[PDB]
PDB file of C-alpha atoms in Angstrom:
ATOM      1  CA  UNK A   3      14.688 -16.043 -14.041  1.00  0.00           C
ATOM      2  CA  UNK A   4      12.879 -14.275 -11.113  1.00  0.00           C
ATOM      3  CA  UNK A   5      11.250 -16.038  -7.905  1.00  0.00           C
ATOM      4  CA  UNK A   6       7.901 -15.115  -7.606  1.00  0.00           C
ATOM      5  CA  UNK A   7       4.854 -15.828  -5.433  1.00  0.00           C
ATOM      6  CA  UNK A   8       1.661 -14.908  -5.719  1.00  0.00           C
ATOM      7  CA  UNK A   9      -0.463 -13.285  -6.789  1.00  0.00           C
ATOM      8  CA  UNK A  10      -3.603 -13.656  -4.392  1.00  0.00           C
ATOM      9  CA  UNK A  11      -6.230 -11.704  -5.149  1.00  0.00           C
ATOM     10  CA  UNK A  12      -8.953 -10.281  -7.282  1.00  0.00           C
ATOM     11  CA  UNK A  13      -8.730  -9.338 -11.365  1.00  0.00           C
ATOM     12  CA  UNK A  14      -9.803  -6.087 -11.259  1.00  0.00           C
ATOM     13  CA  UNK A  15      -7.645  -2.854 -11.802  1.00  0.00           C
ATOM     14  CA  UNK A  16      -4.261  -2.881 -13.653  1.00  0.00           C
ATOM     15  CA  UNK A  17      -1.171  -4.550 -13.727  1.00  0.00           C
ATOM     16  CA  UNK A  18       2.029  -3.526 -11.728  1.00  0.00           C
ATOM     17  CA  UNK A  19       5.351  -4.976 -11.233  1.00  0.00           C
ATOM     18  CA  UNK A  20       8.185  -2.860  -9.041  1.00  0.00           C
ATOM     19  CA  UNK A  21      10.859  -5.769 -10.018  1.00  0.00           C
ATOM     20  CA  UNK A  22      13.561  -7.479  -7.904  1.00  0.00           C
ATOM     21  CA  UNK A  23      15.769  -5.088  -5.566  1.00  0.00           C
ATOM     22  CA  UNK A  24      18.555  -5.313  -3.334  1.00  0.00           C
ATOM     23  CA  UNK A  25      17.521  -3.226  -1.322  1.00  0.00           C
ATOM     24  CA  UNK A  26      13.955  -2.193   0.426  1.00  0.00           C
ATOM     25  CA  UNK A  27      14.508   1.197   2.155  1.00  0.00           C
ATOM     26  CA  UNK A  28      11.105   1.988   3.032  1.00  0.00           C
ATOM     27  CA  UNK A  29       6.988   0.786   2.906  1.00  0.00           C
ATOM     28  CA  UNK A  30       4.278   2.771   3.109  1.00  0.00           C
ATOM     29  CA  UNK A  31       1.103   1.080   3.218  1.00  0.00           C
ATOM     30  CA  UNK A  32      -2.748   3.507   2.901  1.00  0.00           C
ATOM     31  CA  UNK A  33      -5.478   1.557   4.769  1.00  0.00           C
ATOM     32  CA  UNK A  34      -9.119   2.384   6.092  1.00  0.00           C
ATOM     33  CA  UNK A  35     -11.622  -0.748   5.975  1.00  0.00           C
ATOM     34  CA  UNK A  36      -9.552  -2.112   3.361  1.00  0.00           C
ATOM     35  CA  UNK A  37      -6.176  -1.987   1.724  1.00  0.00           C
ATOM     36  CA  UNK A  38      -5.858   1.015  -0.835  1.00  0.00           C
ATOM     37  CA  UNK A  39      -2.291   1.866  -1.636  1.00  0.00           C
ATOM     38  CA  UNK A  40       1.422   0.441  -1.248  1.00  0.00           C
ATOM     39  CA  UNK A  41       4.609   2.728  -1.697  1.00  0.00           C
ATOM     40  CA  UNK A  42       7.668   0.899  -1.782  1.00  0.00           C
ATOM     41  CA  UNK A  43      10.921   3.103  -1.554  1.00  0.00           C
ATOM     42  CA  UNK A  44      14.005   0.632  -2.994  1.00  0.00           C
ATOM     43  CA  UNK A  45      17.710   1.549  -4.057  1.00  0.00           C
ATOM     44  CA  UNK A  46      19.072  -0.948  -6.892  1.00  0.00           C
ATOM     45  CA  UNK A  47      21.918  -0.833  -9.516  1.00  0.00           C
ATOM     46  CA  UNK A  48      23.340   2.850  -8.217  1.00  0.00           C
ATOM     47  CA  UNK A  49      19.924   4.575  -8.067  1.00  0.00           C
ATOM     48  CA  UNK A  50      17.142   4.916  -5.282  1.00  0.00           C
ATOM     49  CA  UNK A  51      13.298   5.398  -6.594  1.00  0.00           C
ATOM     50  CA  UNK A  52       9.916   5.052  -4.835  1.00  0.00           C
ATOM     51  CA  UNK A  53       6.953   3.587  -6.468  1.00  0.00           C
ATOM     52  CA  UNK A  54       2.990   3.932  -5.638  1.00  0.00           C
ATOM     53  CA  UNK A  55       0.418   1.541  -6.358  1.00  0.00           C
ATOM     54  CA  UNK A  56      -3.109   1.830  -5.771  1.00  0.00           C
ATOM     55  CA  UNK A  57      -5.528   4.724  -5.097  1.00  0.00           C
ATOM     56  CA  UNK A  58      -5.706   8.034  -3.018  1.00  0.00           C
ATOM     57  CA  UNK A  59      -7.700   6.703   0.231  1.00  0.00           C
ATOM     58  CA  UNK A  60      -6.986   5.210   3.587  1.00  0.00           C
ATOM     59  CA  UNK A  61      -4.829   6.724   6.384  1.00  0.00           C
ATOM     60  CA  UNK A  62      -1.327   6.057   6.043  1.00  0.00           C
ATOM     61  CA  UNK A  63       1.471   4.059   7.528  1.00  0.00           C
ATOM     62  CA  UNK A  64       5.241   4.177   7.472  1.00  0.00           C
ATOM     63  CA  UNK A  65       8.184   2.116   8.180  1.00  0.00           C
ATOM     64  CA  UNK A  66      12.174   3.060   7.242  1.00  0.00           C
ATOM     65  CA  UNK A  67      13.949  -0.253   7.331  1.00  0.00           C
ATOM     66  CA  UNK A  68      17.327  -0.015   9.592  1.00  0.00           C
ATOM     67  CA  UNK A  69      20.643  -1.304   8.157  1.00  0.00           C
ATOM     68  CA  UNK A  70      20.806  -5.046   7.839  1.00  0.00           C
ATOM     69  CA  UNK A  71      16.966  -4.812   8.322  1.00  0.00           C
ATOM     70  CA  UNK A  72      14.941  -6.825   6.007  1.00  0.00           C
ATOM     71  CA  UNK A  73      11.255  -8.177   5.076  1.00  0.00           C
ATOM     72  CA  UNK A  74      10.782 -12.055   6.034  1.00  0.00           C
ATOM     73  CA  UNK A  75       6.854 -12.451   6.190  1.00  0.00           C
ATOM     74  CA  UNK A  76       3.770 -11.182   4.614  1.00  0.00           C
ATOM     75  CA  UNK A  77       0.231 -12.003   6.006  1.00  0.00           C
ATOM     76  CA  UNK A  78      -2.758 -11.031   4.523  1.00  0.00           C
ATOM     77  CA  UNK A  79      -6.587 -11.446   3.426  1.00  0.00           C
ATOM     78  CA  UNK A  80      -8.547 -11.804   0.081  1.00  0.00           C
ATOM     79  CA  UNK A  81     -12.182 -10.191   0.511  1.00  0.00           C
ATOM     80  CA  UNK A  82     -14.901  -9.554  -1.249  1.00  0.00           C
ATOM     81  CA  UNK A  83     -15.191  -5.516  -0.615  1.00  0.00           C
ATOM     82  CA  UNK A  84     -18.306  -3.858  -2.124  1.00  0.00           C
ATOM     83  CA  UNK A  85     -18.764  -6.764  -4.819  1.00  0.00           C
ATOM     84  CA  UNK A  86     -14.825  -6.188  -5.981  1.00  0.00           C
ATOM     85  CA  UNK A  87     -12.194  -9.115  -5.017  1.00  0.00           C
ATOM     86  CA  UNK A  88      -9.593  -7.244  -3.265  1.00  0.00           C
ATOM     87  CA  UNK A  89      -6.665  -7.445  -0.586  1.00  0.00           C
ATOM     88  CA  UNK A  90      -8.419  -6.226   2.640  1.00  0.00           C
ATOM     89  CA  UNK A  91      -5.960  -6.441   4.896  1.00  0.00           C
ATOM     90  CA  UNK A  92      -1.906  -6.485   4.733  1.00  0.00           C
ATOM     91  CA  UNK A  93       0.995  -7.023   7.515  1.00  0.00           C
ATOM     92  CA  UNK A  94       4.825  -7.038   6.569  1.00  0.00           C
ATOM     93  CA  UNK A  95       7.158  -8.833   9.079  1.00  0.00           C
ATOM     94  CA  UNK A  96      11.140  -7.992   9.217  1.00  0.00           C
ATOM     95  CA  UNK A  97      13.928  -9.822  11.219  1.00  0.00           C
ATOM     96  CA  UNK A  98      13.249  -7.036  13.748  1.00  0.00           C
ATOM     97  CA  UNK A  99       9.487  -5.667  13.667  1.00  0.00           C
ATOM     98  CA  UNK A 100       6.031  -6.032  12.771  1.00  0.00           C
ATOM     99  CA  UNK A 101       4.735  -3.731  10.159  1.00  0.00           C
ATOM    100  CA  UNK A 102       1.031  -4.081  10.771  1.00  0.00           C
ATOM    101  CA  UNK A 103      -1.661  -5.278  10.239  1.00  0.00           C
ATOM    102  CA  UNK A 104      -3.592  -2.657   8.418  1.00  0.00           C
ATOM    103  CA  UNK A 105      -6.916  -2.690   6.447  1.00  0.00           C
ATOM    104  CA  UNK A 106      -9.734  -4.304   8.747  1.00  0.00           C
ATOM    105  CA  UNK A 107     -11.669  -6.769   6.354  1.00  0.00           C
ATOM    106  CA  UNK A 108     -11.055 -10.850   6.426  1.00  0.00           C
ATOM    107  CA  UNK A 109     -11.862 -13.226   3.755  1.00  0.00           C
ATOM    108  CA  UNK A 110      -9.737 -16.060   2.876  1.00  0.00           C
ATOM    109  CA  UNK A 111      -6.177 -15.612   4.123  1.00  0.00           C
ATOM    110  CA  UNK A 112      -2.725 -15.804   2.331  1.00  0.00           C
ATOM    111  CA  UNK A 113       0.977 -16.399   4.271  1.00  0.00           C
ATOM    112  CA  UNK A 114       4.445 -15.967   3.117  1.00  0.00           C
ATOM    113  CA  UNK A 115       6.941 -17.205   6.154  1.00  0.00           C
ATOM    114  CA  UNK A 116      10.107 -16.807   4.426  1.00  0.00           C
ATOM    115  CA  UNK A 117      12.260 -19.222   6.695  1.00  0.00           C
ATOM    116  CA  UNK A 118      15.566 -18.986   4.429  1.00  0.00           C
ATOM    117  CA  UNK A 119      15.439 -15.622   2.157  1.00  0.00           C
ATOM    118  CA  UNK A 120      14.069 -12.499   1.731  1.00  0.00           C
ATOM    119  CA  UNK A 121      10.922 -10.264  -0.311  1.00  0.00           C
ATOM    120  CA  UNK A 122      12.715  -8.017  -2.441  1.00  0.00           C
ATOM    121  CA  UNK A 123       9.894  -6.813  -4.124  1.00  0.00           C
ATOM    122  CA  UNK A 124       6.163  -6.765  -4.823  1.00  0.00           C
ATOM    123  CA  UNK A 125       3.957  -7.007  -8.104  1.00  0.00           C
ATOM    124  CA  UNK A 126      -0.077  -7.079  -8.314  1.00  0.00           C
ATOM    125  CA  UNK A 127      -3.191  -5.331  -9.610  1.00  0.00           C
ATOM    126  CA  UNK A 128      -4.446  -1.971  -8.364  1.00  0.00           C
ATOM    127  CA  UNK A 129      -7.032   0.607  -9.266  1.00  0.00           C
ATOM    128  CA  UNK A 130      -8.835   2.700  -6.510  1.00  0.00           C
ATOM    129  CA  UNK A 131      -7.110  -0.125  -4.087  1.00  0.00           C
ATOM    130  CA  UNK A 132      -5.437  -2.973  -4.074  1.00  0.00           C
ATOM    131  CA  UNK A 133      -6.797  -5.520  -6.189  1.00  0.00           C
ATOM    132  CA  UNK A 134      -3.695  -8.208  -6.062  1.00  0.00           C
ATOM    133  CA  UNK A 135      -0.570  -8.562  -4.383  1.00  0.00           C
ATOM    134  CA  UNK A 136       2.406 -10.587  -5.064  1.00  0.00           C
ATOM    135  CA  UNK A 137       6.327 -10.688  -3.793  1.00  0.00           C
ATOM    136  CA  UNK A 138       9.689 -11.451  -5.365  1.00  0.00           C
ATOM    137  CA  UNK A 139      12.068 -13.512  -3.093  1.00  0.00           C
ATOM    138  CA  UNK A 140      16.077 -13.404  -3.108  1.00  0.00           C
ATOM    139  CA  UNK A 141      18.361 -15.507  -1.192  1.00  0.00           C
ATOM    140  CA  UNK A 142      20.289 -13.476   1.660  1.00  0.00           C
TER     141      UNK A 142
ATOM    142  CA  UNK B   3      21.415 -19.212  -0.130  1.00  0.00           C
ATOM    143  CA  UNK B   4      18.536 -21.374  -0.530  1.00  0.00           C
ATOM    144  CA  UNK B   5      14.862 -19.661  -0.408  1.00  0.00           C
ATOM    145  CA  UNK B   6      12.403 -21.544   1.717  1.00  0.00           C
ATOM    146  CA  UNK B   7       8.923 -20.095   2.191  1.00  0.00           C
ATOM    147  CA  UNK B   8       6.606 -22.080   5.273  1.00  0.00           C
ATOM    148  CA  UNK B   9       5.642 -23.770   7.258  1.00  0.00           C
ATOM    149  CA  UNK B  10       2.332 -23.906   7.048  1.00  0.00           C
ATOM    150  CA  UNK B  11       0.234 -26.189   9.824  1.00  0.00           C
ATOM    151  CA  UNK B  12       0.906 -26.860  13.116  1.00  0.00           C
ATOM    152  CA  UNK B  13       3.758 -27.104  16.124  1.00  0.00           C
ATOM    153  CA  UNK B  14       3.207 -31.195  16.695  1.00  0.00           C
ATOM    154  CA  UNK B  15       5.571 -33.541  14.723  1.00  0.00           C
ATOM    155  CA  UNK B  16       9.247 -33.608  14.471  1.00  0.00           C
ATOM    156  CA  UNK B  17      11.606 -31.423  11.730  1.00  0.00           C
ATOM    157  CA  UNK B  18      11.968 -32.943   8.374  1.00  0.00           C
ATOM    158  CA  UNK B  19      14.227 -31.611   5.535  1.00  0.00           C
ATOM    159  CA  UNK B  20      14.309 -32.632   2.160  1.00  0.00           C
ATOM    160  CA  UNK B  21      16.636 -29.995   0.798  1.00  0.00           C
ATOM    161  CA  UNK B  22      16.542 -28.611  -2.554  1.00  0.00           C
ATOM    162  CA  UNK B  23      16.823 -30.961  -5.377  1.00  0.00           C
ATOM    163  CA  UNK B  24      18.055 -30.719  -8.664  1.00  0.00           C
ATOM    164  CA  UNK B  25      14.895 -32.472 -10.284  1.00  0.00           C
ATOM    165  CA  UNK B  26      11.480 -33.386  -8.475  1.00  0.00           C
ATOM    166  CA  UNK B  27      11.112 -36.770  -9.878  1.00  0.00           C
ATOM    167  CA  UNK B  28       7.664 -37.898  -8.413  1.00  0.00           C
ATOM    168  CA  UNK B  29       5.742 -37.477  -5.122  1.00  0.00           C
ATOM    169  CA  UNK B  30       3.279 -39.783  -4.144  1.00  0.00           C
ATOM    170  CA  UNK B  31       0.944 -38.366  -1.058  1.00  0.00           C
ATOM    171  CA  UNK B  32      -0.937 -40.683   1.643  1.00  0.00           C
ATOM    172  CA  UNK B  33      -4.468 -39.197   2.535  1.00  0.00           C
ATOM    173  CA  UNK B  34      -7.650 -39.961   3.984  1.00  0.00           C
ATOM    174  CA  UNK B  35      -9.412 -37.583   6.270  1.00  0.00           C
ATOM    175  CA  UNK B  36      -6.201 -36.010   5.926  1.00  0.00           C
ATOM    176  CA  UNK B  37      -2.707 -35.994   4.730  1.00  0.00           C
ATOM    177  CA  UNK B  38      -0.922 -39.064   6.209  1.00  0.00           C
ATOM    178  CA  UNK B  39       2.130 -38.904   4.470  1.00  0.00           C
ATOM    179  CA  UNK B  40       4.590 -37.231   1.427  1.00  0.00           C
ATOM    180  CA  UNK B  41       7.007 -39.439  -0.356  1.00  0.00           C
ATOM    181  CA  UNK B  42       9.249 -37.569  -3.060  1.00  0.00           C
ATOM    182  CA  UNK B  43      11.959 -39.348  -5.462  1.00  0.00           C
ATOM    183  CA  UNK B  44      14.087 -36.500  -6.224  1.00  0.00           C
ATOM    184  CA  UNK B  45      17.816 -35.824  -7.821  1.00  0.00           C
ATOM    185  CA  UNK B  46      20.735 -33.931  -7.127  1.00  0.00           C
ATOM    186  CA  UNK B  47      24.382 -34.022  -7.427  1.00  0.00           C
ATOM    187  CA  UNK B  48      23.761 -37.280 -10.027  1.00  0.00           C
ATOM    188  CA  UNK B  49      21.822 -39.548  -7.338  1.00  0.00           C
ATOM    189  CA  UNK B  50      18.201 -40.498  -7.433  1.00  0.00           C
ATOM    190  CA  UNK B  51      16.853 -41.344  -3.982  1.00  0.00           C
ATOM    191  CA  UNK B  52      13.305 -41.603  -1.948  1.00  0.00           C
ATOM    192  CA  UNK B  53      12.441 -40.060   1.123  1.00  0.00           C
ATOM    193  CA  UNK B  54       9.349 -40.740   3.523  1.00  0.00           C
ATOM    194  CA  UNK B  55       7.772 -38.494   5.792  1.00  0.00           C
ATOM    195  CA  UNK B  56       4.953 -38.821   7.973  1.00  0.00           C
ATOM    196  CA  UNK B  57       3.045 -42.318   8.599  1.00  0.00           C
ATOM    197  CA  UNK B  58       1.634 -45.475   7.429  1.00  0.00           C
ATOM    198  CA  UNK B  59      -2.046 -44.340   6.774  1.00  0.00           C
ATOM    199  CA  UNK B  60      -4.280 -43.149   3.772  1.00  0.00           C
ATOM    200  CA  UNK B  61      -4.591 -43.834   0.631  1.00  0.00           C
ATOM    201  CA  UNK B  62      -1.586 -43.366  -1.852  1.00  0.00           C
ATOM    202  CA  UNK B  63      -2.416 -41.145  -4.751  1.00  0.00           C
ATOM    203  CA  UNK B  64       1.051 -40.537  -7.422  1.00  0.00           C
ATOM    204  CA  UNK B  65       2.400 -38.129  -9.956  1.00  0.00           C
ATOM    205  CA  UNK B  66       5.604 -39.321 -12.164  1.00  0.00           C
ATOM    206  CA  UNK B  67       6.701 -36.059 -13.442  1.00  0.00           C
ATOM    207  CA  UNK B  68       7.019 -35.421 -17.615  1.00  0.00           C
ATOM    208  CA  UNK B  69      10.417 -34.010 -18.981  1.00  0.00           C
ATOM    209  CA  UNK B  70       9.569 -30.095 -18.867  1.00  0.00           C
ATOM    210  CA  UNK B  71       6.907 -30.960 -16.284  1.00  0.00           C
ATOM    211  CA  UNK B  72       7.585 -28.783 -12.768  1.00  0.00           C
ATOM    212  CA  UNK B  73       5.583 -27.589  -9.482  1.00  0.00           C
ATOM    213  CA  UNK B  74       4.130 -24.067  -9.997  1.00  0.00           C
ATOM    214  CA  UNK B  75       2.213 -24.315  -6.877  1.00  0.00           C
ATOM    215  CA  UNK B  76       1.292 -26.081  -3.401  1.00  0.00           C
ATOM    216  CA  UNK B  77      -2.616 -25.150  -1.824  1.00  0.00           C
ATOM    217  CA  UNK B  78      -3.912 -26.354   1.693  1.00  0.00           C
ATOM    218  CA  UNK B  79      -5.538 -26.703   4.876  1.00  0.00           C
ATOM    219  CA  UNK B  80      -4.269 -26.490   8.374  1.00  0.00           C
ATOM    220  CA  UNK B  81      -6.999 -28.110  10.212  1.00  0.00           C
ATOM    221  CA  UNK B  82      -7.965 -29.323  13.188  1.00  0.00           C
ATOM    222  CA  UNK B  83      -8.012 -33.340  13.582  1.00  0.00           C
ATOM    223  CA  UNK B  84      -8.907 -35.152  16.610  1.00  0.00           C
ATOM    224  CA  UNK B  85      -7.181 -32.135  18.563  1.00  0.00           C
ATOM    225  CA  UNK B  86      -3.639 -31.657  16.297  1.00  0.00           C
ATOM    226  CA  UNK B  87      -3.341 -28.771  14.445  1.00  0.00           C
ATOM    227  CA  UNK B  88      -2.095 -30.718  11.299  1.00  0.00           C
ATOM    228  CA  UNK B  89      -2.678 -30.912   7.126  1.00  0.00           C
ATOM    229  CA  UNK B  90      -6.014 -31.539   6.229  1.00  0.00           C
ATOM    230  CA  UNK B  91      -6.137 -31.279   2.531  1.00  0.00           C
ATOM    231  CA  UNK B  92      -3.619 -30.818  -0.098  1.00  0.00           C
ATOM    232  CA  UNK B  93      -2.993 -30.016  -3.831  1.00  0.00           C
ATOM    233  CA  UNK B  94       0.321 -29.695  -5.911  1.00  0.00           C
ATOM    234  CA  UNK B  95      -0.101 -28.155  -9.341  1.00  0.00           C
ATOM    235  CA  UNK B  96       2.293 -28.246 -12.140  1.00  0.00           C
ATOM    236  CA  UNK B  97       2.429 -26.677 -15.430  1.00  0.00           C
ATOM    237  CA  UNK B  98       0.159 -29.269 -17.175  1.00  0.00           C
ATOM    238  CA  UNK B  99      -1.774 -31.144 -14.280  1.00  0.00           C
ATOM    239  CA  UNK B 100      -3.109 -30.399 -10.933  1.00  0.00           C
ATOM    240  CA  UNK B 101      -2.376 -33.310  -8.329  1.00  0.00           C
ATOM    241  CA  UNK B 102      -5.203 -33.877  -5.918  1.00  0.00           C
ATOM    242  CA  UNK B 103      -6.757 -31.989  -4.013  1.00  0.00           C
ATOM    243  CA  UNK B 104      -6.603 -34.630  -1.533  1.00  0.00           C
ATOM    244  CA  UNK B 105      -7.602 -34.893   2.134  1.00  0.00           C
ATOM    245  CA  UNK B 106     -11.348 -34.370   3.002  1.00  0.00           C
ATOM    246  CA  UNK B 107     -10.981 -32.281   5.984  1.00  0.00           C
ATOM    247  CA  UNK B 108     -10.967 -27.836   6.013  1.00  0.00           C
ATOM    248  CA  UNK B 109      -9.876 -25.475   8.450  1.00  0.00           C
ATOM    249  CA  UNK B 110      -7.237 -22.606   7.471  1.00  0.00           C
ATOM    250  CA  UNK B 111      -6.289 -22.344   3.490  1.00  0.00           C
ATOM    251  CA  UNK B 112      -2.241 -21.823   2.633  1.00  0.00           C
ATOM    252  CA  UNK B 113      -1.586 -21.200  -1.002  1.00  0.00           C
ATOM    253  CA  UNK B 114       1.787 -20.601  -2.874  1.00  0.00           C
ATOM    254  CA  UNK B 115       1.206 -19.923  -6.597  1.00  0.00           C
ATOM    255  CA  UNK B 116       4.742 -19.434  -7.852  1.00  0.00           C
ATOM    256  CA  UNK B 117       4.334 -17.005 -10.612  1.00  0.00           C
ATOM    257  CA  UNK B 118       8.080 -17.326 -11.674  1.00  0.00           C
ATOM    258  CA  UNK B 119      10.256 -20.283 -10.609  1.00  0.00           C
ATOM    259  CA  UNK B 120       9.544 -23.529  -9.136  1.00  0.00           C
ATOM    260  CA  UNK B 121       9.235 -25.642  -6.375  1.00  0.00           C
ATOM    261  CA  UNK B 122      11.772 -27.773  -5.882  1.00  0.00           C
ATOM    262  CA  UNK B 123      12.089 -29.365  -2.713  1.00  0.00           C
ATOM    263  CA  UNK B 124       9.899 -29.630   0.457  1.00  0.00           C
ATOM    264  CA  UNK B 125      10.267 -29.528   4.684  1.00  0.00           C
ATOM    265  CA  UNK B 126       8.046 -29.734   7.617  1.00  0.00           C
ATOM    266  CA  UNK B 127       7.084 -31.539  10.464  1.00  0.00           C
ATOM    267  CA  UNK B 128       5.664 -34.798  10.814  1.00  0.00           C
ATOM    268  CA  UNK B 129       5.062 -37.866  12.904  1.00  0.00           C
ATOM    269  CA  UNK B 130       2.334 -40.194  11.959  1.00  0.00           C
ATOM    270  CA  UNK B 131       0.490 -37.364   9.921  1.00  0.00           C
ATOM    271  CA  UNK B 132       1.996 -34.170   7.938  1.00  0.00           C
ATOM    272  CA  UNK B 133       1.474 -31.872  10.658  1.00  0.00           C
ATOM    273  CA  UNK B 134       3.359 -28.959   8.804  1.00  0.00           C
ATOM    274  CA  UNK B 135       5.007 -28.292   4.720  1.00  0.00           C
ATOM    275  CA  UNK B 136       6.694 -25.922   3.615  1.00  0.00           C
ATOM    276  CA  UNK B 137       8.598 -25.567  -0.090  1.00  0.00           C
ATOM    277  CA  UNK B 138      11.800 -24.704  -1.272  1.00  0.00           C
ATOM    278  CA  UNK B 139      11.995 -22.301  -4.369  1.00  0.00           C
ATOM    279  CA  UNK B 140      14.216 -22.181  -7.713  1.00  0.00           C
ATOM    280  CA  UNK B 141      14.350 -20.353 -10.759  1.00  0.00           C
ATOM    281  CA  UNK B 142      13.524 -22.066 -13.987  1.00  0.00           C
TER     282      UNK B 142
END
């Protein structure tokens, strides 16, 4: 009963799935040459948790989304990294700011525009880094 | 409270809108070098109807969808053709065929598996070619 798109990607590493939630409070994406960890910071159904996916590496980056502040883009690459088929680079896009990009390696590119809606989540395949990525969409 | 994701291709063309429909009931695509046109016969609200968008070129090239039978995903190229920044190639795939790819030309790929849901109506921008798409999602 979900929307969701995606994944792009390799089939490496393991399966993850944060769900659907109402709200996003806060990303945190770990990037050097490549894309190695997302931590996604959501408050649904009473309760507020944060969730990490992917590895230890790559210098971090943080953004705490403002009231009424929400994601309407991703933008991103699929690249061969070291012989593994991975996300190499990653960029978020809200109704106010961009959030990126990070990760410096290009391959074959992947765009979510979300014209009417919103990502309210994200789902994939991770190991050391991000292998796959994938988003839920709501209405507004 | 619709979810549209796109567009993909380029600034030339006028606005098109299908809307969301009810039930995708075929779509029959014009292509050559590259995609010419999109016709869909769609229903909503208990009336069948067809819509054209783009021109009078290319080849036509149809799917009649089976009862059960709905888009899971669209796949592209924004290319560059004779100067326009339009669609080059195209493919819709559904949960038992894959329509096309058609178009012959490459440039930019666009890809939106939907993983859970559907597409179930279409916009853009077009004038005597597709020269963007974009798809509206459901839930199944």
């Amino acid at each position: 009963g979900a929307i969701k798109v995606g994944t792009w990607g390799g089939n490496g590493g393991s399966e993850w799935d944060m769900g659907p939630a109402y709200r996003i409070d806060s990303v945190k994406i770990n990037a050097g040459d490549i894309i190695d960890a997302i931590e996604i910071t959501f408050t649904r159904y009473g309760l507020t948790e944060t969730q990490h996916y992917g590895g230890t590496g790559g210098e971090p980056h943080e953004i705490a989304f403002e009231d009424g502040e929400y994601i309407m883009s991703m933008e991103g690459h699929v690249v061969d990294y070291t012989g593994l088929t991975i996300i190499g680079k990653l960029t978020l896009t809200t109704n106010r700011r961009t959030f990126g990009p990070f990760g410096a390696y290009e391959g074959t590119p992947f765009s979510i525009p979300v014209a009417e809606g919103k990502i309210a989540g994200f789902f994939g395949r991770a190991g050391s880094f991000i292998d796959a990525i994938g988003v839920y969409l709501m209405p507004n």
